Structures are given as C-alpha cells and as structure tokens.
C-alpha cells in the first residue's frame, strides 16, 4: 500500500508489587497531583518521554502518552524509579501494553456512505453523534475511525503488528470507495 | 415551539455541573472520621445512617465499615432498625 | 336537560384535575432531588385527549 | 363549552404549590425552594392531523371518516412558573402555549 | 462526650492487648493526645454518668474488666 | 485552626517573631500567641478579600507543579507579571494556592 | 488573687442575670439551655474544620 | 498604598484580638507591646527488577528546600490545562517579589510545561 | 393470570377502621412491571411529538427484545426506551434527530446515542443512513413554508 500508520499514543500497565501512600507520593513527588475527590489515583507527568502515568494505592500503574513501545517501557521504569526514590519498594512486574493508538492518511477523500452501505455488518456511521465512521474489524480486534478527509485512526491494538495488519486490511476497502 | 430540540435539558445540565463541582466524597483517615462520629454522637444519642453520611462526608461503604467496627444496629420502635453510635 | 357542553365540561373538569395531580407528582420527585423539572415533560398529554 | 367552560375550568383549578422536603438537612430556614404553577389563557387550534412523518396538516372531516381518524383540535395553555428559593429573588418564567 | 466514647473504644483496644491493668483517666487522656483541664472535669462528670451505666465496665478503683464472661 | 496561608510571608514572619520575643520575655503564653496568629489569619483573609479591587496578569513557563489536599504548589520560571500600570520581571516564582 | 476571686463571683452573678433576665424575653414572646445546645453543635464543625489545619501545615 | 493597606490590617488585627485578650484574662498592654515590636521588626534486561540501570533521571530538589526566591500565596478558583499549557484563575492573594509586596484581586496566568 | 377486587357494597367490606378490600391487591413481578413502566414512558414520549401508534408498537417490540437480551441492564430504563424510539423511527423511514428525541425524553442526547449504539449491537441489526430528504417535510411544515419552498429545499439539499 505504501502507507504505514504511525503511533500517537500507547497505554501500558505495570504492577509495582507493593502498596503505596498516595498522599505521601503527592507531597514528595515533583510533577504529581492527587485529588481524591476527583480521582482515586495520583497523576504524574514526565516531559522527557512526554508521558503521563496514573499511580494507585494498590501498586498498579498505567502509563499513557508514549509514542513508542520502548518509550512506554522506559517511562514506566522512570515512574517506578521515582516512586522507589520516595522510599517505597517499587518494582517492575508484569509490564504489558494494554492499548495502542495509531494514525495515518490515505491521501484521498472517502465516501463513508458507500462504505457503510457495503460493510454495514462492521460499519457504524452516525453524523449526529460523531462525524467519523467507526469500523470494527474482526480478524484483528481493531476499531478504525475513518473520516471524509482521509485520516484514519486505529485503536484497540496490543501490538504494532495489529495496527499495521488492520491498516493493510482496510486500505483496499477504502481504495474501493475513493471520492 | 413546544418540545423544541435541545441537546440536553437545562435543569439536568445545572444539576450535573453542581455534582461535578462538588465531586465524590473522599475516604478520610480512620482517626478523623472516628473523631467526627464521636462528636456527632455527643450532639444526642440516635442517628440514622443517611444523615450520618451527610454529617461525616465519607463514602457509604467506608463509613459503614468504621461504624460496624464500633457502633451496633438496634431494632427499635422509633421507625426502624438504626445505628447506635455508643460502642457498648 | 344536560346537552353536549355541560357533559363535556364535567369530563374535562375531572381530567384537568387528574392532569394537575400528575404534574404535582412528577414535579415533586424532581424537586426532592433538587433538579429544576421541565414543565413540558411534566404535562401528560394523553390524559385529556 | 369550548369558549367559556374550558377556560373557566383552567382558571378555577387552584395553583400548584410545591416545595422540597427539608432537602440537604441544613439550617433549613425555608431553604427548600417553593415552585408555584398557574395555568392561564387556554388556546385551541384548528383540527389538525400529524402524519407518520410528523408534519402537521389540516384534517378534513371526510378524511377522518375514511381513514378512521378522530376529529380533534390541539389544546394549548399558558403556564407561569415561579421559583422562590429564599434567595431574596423570585423568578417568574412563562411558558407560552404548552 | 464523643471523645469519651472514643476513650471507651481505646480501652476496648486495650482489652484486645490483653495487658489490661488497673488504670486511671489521666494516662489514657495523655496517650490519646488530650489535655487535663476543667474540660477533663466536665467530661469526668459525663464519665461518672457513664459509671452509672458502664456495660463496658468502668469502675473507680481497680477496674475496666468489661467482659461479663472472661477467662483465657 | 484556619486556612493558614499568609503565615509564611513577611507579615506573618514579623508577627511570629514578635510573639517569640514576648514568649521569651514571658509576657504572653504560647496559647495566647497561637490565638493571636489565628485572629491575624482571619483578619488578613477578610482584608484581602474586601479591600483589594485591582486586576493583575502574568505569563511565563512552568517547571514543576504539585497538588495535594487542595493545595497547588506551582513552580514557574522566567515569569513576567504584567499589569496595566506596571510590568515586573522575575527569573523564578513559586505559586502556592489553596481553596 | 482574692480580689480576682471576687470578680469571678461577680461574673457568675452577671451570667445568671443575663440568662434569667431574658429566659423571660423568650417566655414573653431556657436561654442558657439554648446557648448550651448551640455550643454542642459547633464541636463537630470545629474539629472537621480543625484537622484540615493539621494537614495544610504538613502540605505547606 | 501597600503600607496604608498594612496599617488598615493592623487596625483590623488589634480589633479582632481585643476580645480574645479579654477572654483569656490577660492585660491589654500586651497588644500595645506586640504592635510596637511588630512595627519595629517590619520596618536485553530480561530480569527487569533492578531500577539502577538508569541514573540521573531527576532534577535538583533543592529549589523547594530553599524557597528563598520570590513566593506567591493566593487562592485558586479555576485551573485548567490542555496537553501543553497551564491556565490560572487565581483570586485575591499576596505576592512577594524581590522583597516588595504586591496585592491583587484577579490574577490570570498562562504557563508552558 | 390474575384478578383484582373492588369496594363491592357498603356493609362488611370496610371493617374496624375501614379495612377497605381486606388489603391492596399487590399483583406482579419486576420483569413485567419495569417493562410496563417503560411502555407507559414510550407512549408519553411518542405523544409528545405526535408519533403514530405503529411506531409506538415497533418501539415496544424493540424494547422487549433489548430488555430480555439484557446487555443494557446497567443502563437506566428511560435511556433504553428513548433509544428504542429513535431506532423505531429510523426503521419506519421517518427519522427523528437525536435532539428531537431528547426534547421529549429526560435522557440527554449523549446517553441516548450510547444506548442506541448498544441496542444496535445487541439486536445485531442496522438502520439505513439518514438523508437530507428525510427531515425536509417535518422541518418545512414546522416552519410553515409553502410546498414549492419545501420542494426547492429538498432538491437543493439532494
């Protein structure tokens, strides 16, 4: 096809294996915020990987905003090391990538009406709710947001291979509806 | 003009804004919650769980756990079985 | 002799009382919650018709 | 009936008075708001039939006979709603042709 | 008076320790981070009212033996 | 037992030092000093709330931030406090906020 | 100090007069009892209000 | 201007502490002495458990320890952030910039992270 | 398979302090009472915008299928009923906008849309995409525009 999606956000969950004090973490950390009335976790941000992580008292942490798998793992390790520097026995256990988000452009307008007519079993086009068509691919469990401008956003992937395979599957279909 | 199309009813958006600004009640430390509970009991002997939740401003499950630790439910002819804040 | 007008007036009296009763109930629920009930939703149009 | 009795029945009905049942368990110095509704000025339209599309259209009597429709006319009432929250301000919004 | 019920809970945890010994009010008030002033006197009036109904036993001398049934 | 914001400022520090001097002289008891601090906090909060009617602006960059118990602890760098009447330049600032 | 004890006895007479000189105003339209009840209500607020002070001092 | 506000604050503070000085039974001369002193004082790692593989992943923490630089203490009504920038509706408060104090009612701020 | 009792005659029906009908009749189960309340709400919402009874019946059938399928048991009833009404209007060929359904339902547009998506998934069905010509008749009639103006607007949009 000659086009490869580029990742825009990666969500990864890792367990530190130890209970934590959210108030102490908020008081002692650099960029952390804690609002128990609003949310039950602690939100921290690191600029060099340009990511944000949520840390829970159960010891499980979620890292989002990373553009690459390596960046996600490094950012999660950095957050764990920050928590460890705060005196806690933080570890790096069962790190896993829960979700990946990729974006790309097909460089031509798309007739979403014909696409939903042809693939009604997988398509969902409701301009009232959202201008982009929602396509639920089955062989890879990927949800694709297709827009009339040609931009395609893929989400729900665990590995980059799923993103690339889903785009490879969707590209001939979209080429069939070029405007 | 009747039943004009609106994205969301005005009263609902006002109520949602108030709830969002207030936020969910936070789970405070056991010591402070216990102290507040004891002062409330000092006001007078009998409290219902709903108004006790209002007074303490704590989650219902957490408050119920702390109250089960010390207080005891008495079945009474007031209206119903309610909590007793006296530990004994 | 009670003609069409008086008979329909009796029926409409009853049904308008019922409509106001339903408005009272529906609005009282929302007032207890502290939401500012919409009058148009309170009115049950089917009652009179 | 239509010209006088319907309007008189609307006006004779007592205004609806509503207030909260000591909501929030605060100082409660008449804190629960008072909602007052008064119906007024009933309006009748010409007989109208709304299609499956929802588009209003006049209903001729013969069409009512043929299609087994009911020859009826919409009934509209002006309602005035006043909110008294003991905030030293009362707001009387008016709903026209409900 | 609420602080008083809190003292009752404190002596209940003291029973839980099993090191229950004849005590008095001052040491408990100190260990529970509370002072000894005329406030202690009014709360001791309340505490003697408690001694009139201390199902959780609070006697004046050698005391605090709450459990109506207690062997180990 | 109050908001307790302005204690760590010039005014609060001067009041605290004066109370320390009187405590050293035995003229006032520490409970009285604490009561004076509480009353000062109430009065200063009311005074700033009421007698201040000027609008200010500022811009810059943020280097750190923290939040806990409804307490923001922002840390900005190269801030420019701009006001219609005057402009002030500062290399670094720490903004502590509460509500 | 003996004079201060006499002044305290005078303040006790003044509180009795104030409480009773109007336990009568209420009747014409228990004042001490009402004051005591009011004092009881603040205790809960005071502490909810107060321990916030402890955490704010730790925060700042 | 700011000194005049300070004098008004002095008046408010003394008036507010008079009742406490009567409640505690202390003589009123304490307030005069306090005001005098106050004015004088003012004017392939398969085994990933070890986190030591990375170092110097932090910054100097001495800024918060020092606090010697300029400090602003106020109250916040709304604080919003959209992925890069922090926005500030800080209400009435006080500022300590270069020793000189500033007083404000509405403060608007935009910063970048 | 039930009955109910009335006052009857004036004699032993009311007892020591007006016992009434010995009782209050107290009939049915929640798996039917909730559906009954939803049917009442559906009729109210439809009458608010003068929807025909065939659309009401299609909405009732859709709600029965959704309610028994139970994938939306966590969603509040009125949202399910409003989404079912929207879907029935779409299937009958006279679509109403999400805002139009929200105007007659206490449920917000966002919740109605979410329940609409969930109901579509649960029923494994689909609704034809709306076109500009679907809303022309209702919009022009509510604006009291002439027939020629309605035709011109429909042609312009198409």
From Swiss-Prot, chain A:
A GO CC term attached to the entry: nucleus
GO molecular function, one term: RNA polymerase III general transcription initiation factor activity
Superkingdom as given in the UniProt entry: Eukaryota
Tissue: Widely expressed, with levels highest in the testis and ovary.
Compartmental location: Nucleus
Alphabetically ordered keywords of this record: Disease variant, DNA-binding, Host-virus interaction, Neurodegeneration, Nucleus, Repeat, Spinocerebellar ataxia, Transcription, Transcription regulation
Gene Ontology process terms (BP): DNA-templated transcription initiation; mRNA transcription by RNA polymerase II; positive regulation of transcription initiation by RNA polymerase II; RNA polymerase II preinitiation complex assembly; spermatogenesis; transcription by RNA polymerase II; transcription by RNA polymerase III; transcription initiation at RNA polymerase II promoter
Swiss-Prot/TrEMBL Sequence repeat ranges: 7-83, 97-174
Residues that, per the record, bind DNA: 9, 45, 60, 99, 136
Family of the protein in this entry: Belongs to the TBP family.
Protein name, as recorded: TATA-box-binding protein
Gene (UniProt): TBP
From Swiss-Prot, chain B:
Binding residues for DNA: 77, 79
Superkingdom in the source lineage: Eukaryota
Coiled coil, from the record: none
Localization (cell): Nucleus
Signal peptide per UniProt: none
Complexes and interactors: Heterodimer of an alpha and a beta subunit. Interacts with HTATSF1 and GPBP1. Interacts with URI1. Interacts with GTF2B (via N-terminus); this interaction is inhibited in presence of GTF2F1.
Family named by the database record: Belongs to the TFIIF beta subunit family.
Job of this protein: TFIIF is a general transcription initiation factor that binds to RNA polymerase II and helps to recruit it to the initiation complex in collaboration with TFIIB.
Record's protein name: General transcription factor IIF subunit 2
Species whose genome carries this gene: Homo sapiens
Residues of the full protein shown: 151 to 238 of 249
From Swiss-Prot, chain E:
DNA-binding region: 1-72
Localisation: Nucleus
Transmembrane segments annotated in the record for this chain: none
Disulfide bonds: none
Physiological role: Recruits TFIIH to the initiation complex and stimulates the RNA polymerase II C-terminal domain kinase and DNA-dependent ATPase activities of TFIIH. Both TFIIH and TFIIE are required for promoter clearance by RNA polymerase.
Self-association and partners: Tetramer of two alpha and two beta chains. Interacts with FACT subunit SUPT16H. Interacts with ATF7IP. Interacts with SND1. Part of TBP-based Pol II pre-initiation complex (PIC), in which Pol II core assembles with general transcription factors and other specific initiation factors including GTF2E1, GTF2E2, GTF2F1, GTF2F2, TCEA1, ERCC2, ERCC3, GTF2H2, GTF2H3, GTF2H4, GTF2H5, GTF2A1, GTF2A2, GTF2B and TBP; this large multi-subunit PIC complex mediates DNA unwinding and targets Pol II core to the transcription start site where the first phosphodiester bond forms.
Protein family membership: Belongs to the TFIIE beta subunit family.
Protein name: Transcription initiation factor IIE subunit beta
Organism: Homo sapiens
From Swiss-Prot, chain G:
Localization in the cell: Nucleus
Disease with which this protein is associated in UniProt: Intellectual developmental disorder, autosomal dominant 73: An autosomal dominant disorder characterized by intellectual disability ranging from mild to severe, developmental delay, speech delay, behavioral abnormalities, and non-specific dysmorphic facial features.
Annotated family: Belongs to the TAF4 family.
Subunit structure: Component of the TFIID basal transcription factor complex, composed of TATA-box-binding protein TBP, and a number of TBP-associated factors (TAFs), including TAF1, TAF2, TAF3, TAF4, TAF5, TAF6, TAF7, TAF8, TAF9, TAF10, TAF11, TAF12 and TAF13. Component of the TFTC-HAT complex, at least composed of TAF5L, TAF6L, TADA3L, SUPT3H, TAF2, TAF4, TAF5, GCN5L2/GCN5, TAF10, TAF12 and TRRAP. (Microbial infection) Interacts with SV40 Large T antigen.
Job of this protein: The TFIID basal transcription factor complex plays a major role in the initiation of RNA polymerase II (Pol II)-dependent transcription. TFIID recognizes and binds promoters with or without a TATA box via its subunit TBP, a TATA-box-binding protein, and promotes assembly of the pre-initiation complex (PIC). The TFIID complex consists of TBP and TBP-associated factors (TAFs), including TAF1, TAF2, TAF3, TAF4, TAF5, TAF6, TAF7, TAF8, TAF9, TAF10, TAF11, TAF12 and TAF13.
Organism: Homo sapiens (Human)
